[PDB]
Amino acid sequence: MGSLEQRRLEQDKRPDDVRDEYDRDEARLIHSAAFRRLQSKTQVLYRTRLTHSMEVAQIGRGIVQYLSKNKKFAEYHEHLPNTSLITAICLAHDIGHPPFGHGGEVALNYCMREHGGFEGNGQTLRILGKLDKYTGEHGLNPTRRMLLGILKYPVAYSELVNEKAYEQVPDKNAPYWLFEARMQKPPKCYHDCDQEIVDFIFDGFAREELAKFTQTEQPIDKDEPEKPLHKKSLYKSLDCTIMNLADNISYSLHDFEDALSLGMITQRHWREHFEGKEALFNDLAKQLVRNDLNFDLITVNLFHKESHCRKEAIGSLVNLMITNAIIEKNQSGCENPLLSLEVKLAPQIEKLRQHIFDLVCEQVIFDENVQQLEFKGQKLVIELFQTLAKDPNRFLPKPTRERLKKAGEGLEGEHKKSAQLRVICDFVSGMTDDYATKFYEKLFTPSKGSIF
Amino acid sequence: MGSLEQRRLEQDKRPDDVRDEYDRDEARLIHSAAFRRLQSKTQVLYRTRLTHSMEVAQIGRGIVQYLSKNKKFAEYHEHLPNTSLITAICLAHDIGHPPFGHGGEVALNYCMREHGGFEGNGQTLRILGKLDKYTGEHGLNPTRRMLLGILKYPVAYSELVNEKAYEQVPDKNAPYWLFEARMQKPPKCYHDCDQEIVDFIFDGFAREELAKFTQTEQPIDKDEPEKPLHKKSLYKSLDCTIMNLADNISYSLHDFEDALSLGMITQRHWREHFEGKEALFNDLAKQLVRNDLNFDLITVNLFHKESHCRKEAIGSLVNLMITNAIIEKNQSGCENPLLSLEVKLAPQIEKLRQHIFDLVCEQVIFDENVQQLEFKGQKLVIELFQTLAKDPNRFLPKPTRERLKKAGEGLEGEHKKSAQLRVICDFVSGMTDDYATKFYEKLFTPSKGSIF
Ligand SMILES: [Mg+2]
Ligand SMILES: [Mg+2]
């Protein structure tokens, strides 16, 4: 089998470069157009995706550091990623996310219904492995282990999608962009047209390991037992578990901290969301003997006037989760360490992390005004994709027109159409929020737009 | 003397934390309000200060890595900073820069003429050591070595300023914000009101070392020999030399790369700026035997249609400077390694780096439209500072009103005034470009502004 430091394309380093291949991955990523676009992309609307990706990289390094010295896990030290690989994986995890976030993701998936759908994490793999113009046709040409580390869902769209969930009540009067977004969310997956990339990631493993590692589950009873739902992938690589843990800690605490600052989560919300289960903080305070973890003391410090009393509690909770990162084996039958080993929190810490994250989804993610803005990004992307798809040679830039022509060669009929719509999907998804707004305004908004 | 890992305020780590003090500095910085503000701050206007600071951190780590293995410099390996310290120093170097960049810096220095002036690098030290609300009154409370690493100019404003350079031809008809900005630029320095911070940084050194390390020079003949000019500090710490080298590589190549993309630097500009001295590339190509360094070959790749041919040359030039980082001793009489040792490029590489950077200043920094926008930031900040200074209790937020009251206590007369204007200067300088624009529009622009 192939090495983990192997790339799809041959790009050997000069003898002047003792940097390991994982550092070369970090260097290419930071100097890449896909990573620099994280500035003009916000996840909530304040906090940009670049800042979130840096905080996630910091948390992941702290996780890897904590594990690399805890001798209870000394048996697994050799399989931990290094500082450069965990950073590059953490800094790349939100690269594929489209403009306007979930509003744009639902939009592109709805437009690509007959052509493979769209999902952000799949586009992250698509950009990293092919789209980014660091190479001709191999993206940034990352190492096998880095590609595996960003593959959060190693199962294809077709193998996971349940198109019965897309079913809608007919409405002759509704425009094409007007629908319930929750019923058009894609499965978390990789795109079928990128199977070659996934083949490379998995050529360094035994095929029985691949079958066990790509196992899925059928979730049941989201509201009713017969409600149709997509299938979920079940397992991620070891490095991916570390990044996914850091990614959730930031969403649970750092987006919570921003919610306190903006006033979207009050102490009344806190004490009502924790009206029961004050032991989520208190019982932990007893076991670890940390008076700072007392529910009433940490509540006063979180909702304190002095900003140094809040950041001290946020950082205390950030440190509490990093110090409670355990590494177990997943219920996959895999014997490879990178496929069988998982990093996660202590069960009592995860209960507290989730319960803080649930208050964030309730007051921030599902705020009426936040959702109204997501729908507008849905309308904008749909209306932009339609127009770019109706006459792509009139509107698209010349290099994008070349890819669309190139994608259709050797293909005819419906396969040619899906391959060319994929290029348009990669063009729109690779837009920044302001670039997509300007592109919308040049095409539709009455008095806006300039030829330069 | 005191240790380099010592902080002004006592904030010892728990036994659960094996992170070194320099990693704790990196962790606090990333989760700090001052570092997160780098998203909404651009240096040129595209590339944000956050992205520039990440690229600088990457270059610095590559420099430290290259030096930590080159055995010609093995005698100095023990004095190199670690990965966390060089990152925190690189990620913090542009924290103090005000809104609208040099336009805002000239603005604040002009307003603070009688009250100590303003300079960005000084505010970086002021934020890191006192202003940031991570602690009560000690900022992020960084280690002594990190504070030293961001102290680019270890000489005070008063000791360097030449107020004859501020002299202006009288103009009764000109508004207060209308002046030549070049004649009101401050010296590169630290603010006199922050001498206590600088005292702490230097208590870990012998006083003779401090006198030699804080030596200055009087530059002569900017245009004419008798043209008045500020004095310059002469020496930086070892870690600061590494950060300052990375900071200049990014400005010389990464801002050059953006200039190619936006069309602000043409191949005609390149071949005319290099009409002579093609040997800046070619002679290096002969010594290192690198055909890619041929002037005509690298020109075709830099100004190529394929974006992978440009990024390959930019990264080749980024790698060429990192591989030519030498560490010598400065002409300071210092015997401490952190004060006597400097990191810099090979003389022939610096000639090429500077000559590329000169084309960036000519076509980008001094573009007429870029300068027109800088002046507008100058007008906006001046008009905002004046109004905030005329009635600070009517306009400033309550916490900022508390600091201004607190800064004036124990003082009367002109010293009280300068101390309270310093708080207003810290408030404006700590604004983001959009926050300062909204604050300007609430106060002056006819139909804009909301009470929320
Ligand atoms: Mg994320
Ligand atoms: Mg800089």
Taking only Cα atoms into account, the Rg of chain B, rounded to an integer number of angstroms, comes to 23
CA distance A226 to A431: 38
Q: Do B50 and A39 touch (CB under 8 A)?
A: yes
CA distance B183 to A331: 70
What are the residues whose beta carbons fall under 8 Å from the beta carbon of A326, sequence distance 6 or more?
Answer: A73, A343, A344, A345, A346
B55 close to A (CB below 8 A) = yes
CB contacts under 8 A, A 211-270 vs B, are 254
Place of tokens 């989201």: A222
Q: State the burial class of residue B282 (Cβ atoms within 10 Å of its Cβ: 0-12, 13-18, 19+).
A: middle
Is A52 annotated in a binding site? The answer is yes
CA distance B332 to B259: 37
Q: Which residues surround ligand 2, an ion (CB under 5 A)?
A: B 94, 247
Give me A133's structure tokens. Answer: 């113009």
Reported in sequence order, the residue ranges of A195-340 that DSSP labels E, i.e. its strands, are 216-217, 232-233, 325-329
- Single-letter amino acid, residue B183: M
Give me A157's structure tokens. Answer: 């769209």
Give B326's strand partners: B344
Q: Exposed e or buried b for every residue in A71-100, given b needs 16+ CB within 10 A? A: eebeebeeebbebbbbbbbbbbbbbbbbbb
**How many residues does this entry show for chain A?**
452
Cα torsion through B256, B344, B318, B46, rounded to 10: -40
| Angle, vertex CA A198, rays to CA A193 and CA A200, nearest 5 | 120
CA nearest to A36 within chain B = B51
Place of tokens 């208190």: A282
CA of B41 to the centre of ligand 2 (A): 12
B136–chain A nearest CA distance, Å: 7
- The three-class DSSP label of residue A327 is strand
What are the residues whose beta carbons fall under 8 Å from the beta carbon of B427, sequence distance 6 or more?
Answer: B388, B396, B400
What are the residues whose beta carbons fall under 8 Å from the beta carbon of B189, sequence distance 6 or more?
Answer: B117, B119, B121, B122, B153, B155, B156, B157, B159, B160, B161, B233
Q: Do A308 and B135 touch (CB under 8 A)?
A: yes
Report the relative pairing of strands B325-329 and B341-345 from DSSP bridges: antiparallel
Query: Are the beta carbons of A242 and A338 closer than 8 angstroms?
Result: no
CA distance B400 to B427: 7
Report the relative pairing of strands B232-233 and B216-217 from DSSP bridges: antiparallel
Cα torsion through B132, B136, B142, B143, rounded to 10: 160
Helices (H) and strands (E) in chain B, counts: 23, 4
Q: Do A319 and B17 touch (CB under 8 A)?
A: yes
Q: State the burial class of residue B58 (Cβ atoms within 10 Å of its Cβ: 0-12, 13-18, 19+).
A: buried
Give me B45's structure tokens. Answer: 């206007």
| Angle, vertex CA B377, rays to CA B371 and CA B378, nearest 5 | 85
Query: Are the beta carbons of B302 and B39 closer than 8 angstroms?
Result: no
Residue B361 is given by DSSP the state I
User: Residue A392: which region, alpha, beta or left (left: phi > 0; alpha: psi -120 to 50)?
Assistant: alpha
Q: What does each C-alpha distance from A55 to B30, B32, B48, B435 come to in angstroms? A: 7, 11, 17, 23
A406 close to B (CB below 8 A) = no
CA nearest neighbour of B151 among B175, B122, B114, B187: B122
Q: Do B133 and A31 touch (CB under 8 A)?
A: no
- The three-class DSSP label of residue B11 is coil
Taking only Cα atoms into account, the Rg of chain A, rounded to an integer number of angstroms, comes to 23
- Single-letter amino acid, residue B133: K
How many CB atoms neighbour CB B305 within 10 A?
A: 8
Place of tokens 């310059």: B232
B434 close to A (CB below 8 A) = no
CA distance A200 to A213: 15
Q: State the burial class of residue B372 (Cβ atoms within 10 Å of its Cβ: 0-12, 13-18, 19+).
A: exposed
User: Residue B31: which region, alpha, beta or left (left: phi > 0; alpha: psi -120 to 50)?
Assistant: alpha
Give B325's strand partners: B345
Q: What does each C-alpha distance from B296 to B6, B80, B267, B349, B411 come to in angstroms? A: 52, 38, 11, 18, 65
CA of A31 to the centre of ligand 2 (A): 16
CA distance B317 to B255: 13
Give me A450's structure tokens. Answer: 């300039």
Query: Are the beta carbons of A159 and A130 closer than 8 angstroms?
Result: no
Query: Are the beta carbons of A236 and A214 closer than 8 angstroms?
Result: no
CA distance A2 to A4: 7
A26 close to B (CB below 8 A) = yes
Q: Do B51 and A50 touch (CB under 8 A)?
A: yes
Number of Cβ pairs closer than 8 Å across A and B? 84
Q: Nearest Cβ partner of A311 from B134, B308, B311? A: B134
CA of A13 to the centre of ligand 1 (A): 31
Query: Are the beta carbons of A176 and A386 closer than 8 angstroms?
Result: yes
CA of A53 to the centre of ligand 1 (A): 7
Give A341's strand partners: A329
CA distance A316 to B27: 12
Give me B260's structure tokens. Answer: 């190619």
CA distance A400 to A384: 15
CA distance A174 to B24: 55
CA of A41 to the centre of ligand 1 (A): 12
Ligand nearest to the CA of B50: 2
Query: Are the beta carbons of A377 and A104 closer than 8 angstroms?
Result: yes
CA B409 to chain centre: 32
**What are the two backbone dihedrals, phi and then psi, of residue A232, each rounded to the nearest 5 degrees?**
-110, 140
B88 close to A (CB below 8 A) = no
Place of tokens 């996840």: A43
CA nearest to B20 within chain A = A65
**How many residues does this entry show for chain B?**
452
- Contacts for B35-39: CB closer than 8 Å, 24+ residues apart: B35/B91, B35/B92, B35/B95, B36/A47, B36/A51, B37/B95, B37/B430, B37/B432, B38/B94, B38/B95, B39/A39, B39/A48, B39/A50, B39/A51
CA A319 to chain centre: 23
Place of tokens 């953490």: A90
CA nearest to A11 within chain B = B312
Helices B49-69, B83-92: crossing angle, 10 deg rounding: 150
CA of B121 to the centre of ligand 2 (A): 10
B70 close to A (CB below 8 A) = no
- Contacts for A383-386: CB closer than 8 Å, 24+ residues apart: A383/A177, A383/A440, A383/A444, A384/A428, A384/A436, A384/A439, A384/A440, A384/A443, A385/A107, A385/A108, A385/A111, A385/A424, A385/A425, A385/A428, A386/A111, A386/A176
Q: Which residues of A touch B33 (CB under 8 A)?
A: 307
CA nearest to B35 within chain A = A51
CA distance A41 to A123: 15
Q: Which residues of A touch B28 (CB under 8 A)?
A: 315
CA of A49 to the centre of ligand 1 (A): 7
| Angle, vertex CA B436, rays to CA B435 and CA B442, nearest 5 | 90
Query: Are the beta carbons of A328 and A241 closer than 8 angstroms?
Result: no
CA nearest neighbour of A147 among A99, A98, A103, A190: A190
CB contacts under 8 A, B 35-54 vs A, are 36, 39, 47-48, 50-51, 54
Helices A83-92, A21-30: crossing angle, 10 deg rounding: 30
Query: Are the beta carbons of B431 and B99 closer than 8 angstroms?
Result: yes
Q: Which residues of A touch B323 (CB under 8 A)?
A: 16
CA distance A211 to B232: 66
Give A232's strand partners: A217
How many CB atoms neighbour CB A162 within 10 A?
A: 14
Give me B320's structure tokens. Answer: 């060429």
Query: Are the beta carbons of B68 and B85 closer than 8 angstroms?
Result: no
**What are the two backbone dihedrals, phi and then psi, of residue B190, each rounded to the nearest 5 degrees?**
-125, 155
Cα torsion through A54, A58, A64, A67, rounded to 10: -150
Give A110's strand partners: none
Ligand nearest to the CA of A245: 1
DSSP code per residue over B86-155: HHHHHHHTTSSPPTTTHHHHHHHHHHTTTTT---HHHHHHHIIIIISTTSSSSTT--BHHHHHHH-S--S
CA of B172 to the centre of ligand 2 (A): 38
> What kind of experiment solved this structure?
X-ray
CA distance B215 to B192: 17
Query: Are the beta carbons of A139 and A207 closer than 8 angstroms?
Result: no
CA distance A107 to A112: 9
Query: Are the beta carbons of B177 and B234 closer than 8 angstroms?
Result: no
Query: Are the beta carbons of A306 and A293 closer than 8 angstroms?
Result: no
Query: Are the beta carbons of B103 and B181 closer than 8 angstroms?
Result: yes
DSSP code per residue over B410-429: T--THHHHHHHHHHHHHHHH
Map B363-374 to HEC letters. Answer: HHHCCHHHHHHH
Query: Are the beta carbons of B190 and B153 closer than 8 angstroms?
Result: yes
Q: Do A136 and B308 touch (CB under 8 A)?
A: yes
Residue B291 is given by DSSP the state G
Query: Are the beta carbons of B44 and B102 closer than 8 angstroms?
Result: no
Q: Which residues of B touch A27 (CB under 8 A)?
A: 58, 62, 315
**What are the two backbone dihedrals, phi and then psi, of residue A210, each rounded to the nearest 5 degrees?**
-70, -45
Residue A48 is given by DSSP the state B
CA nearest to A15 within chain B = B323
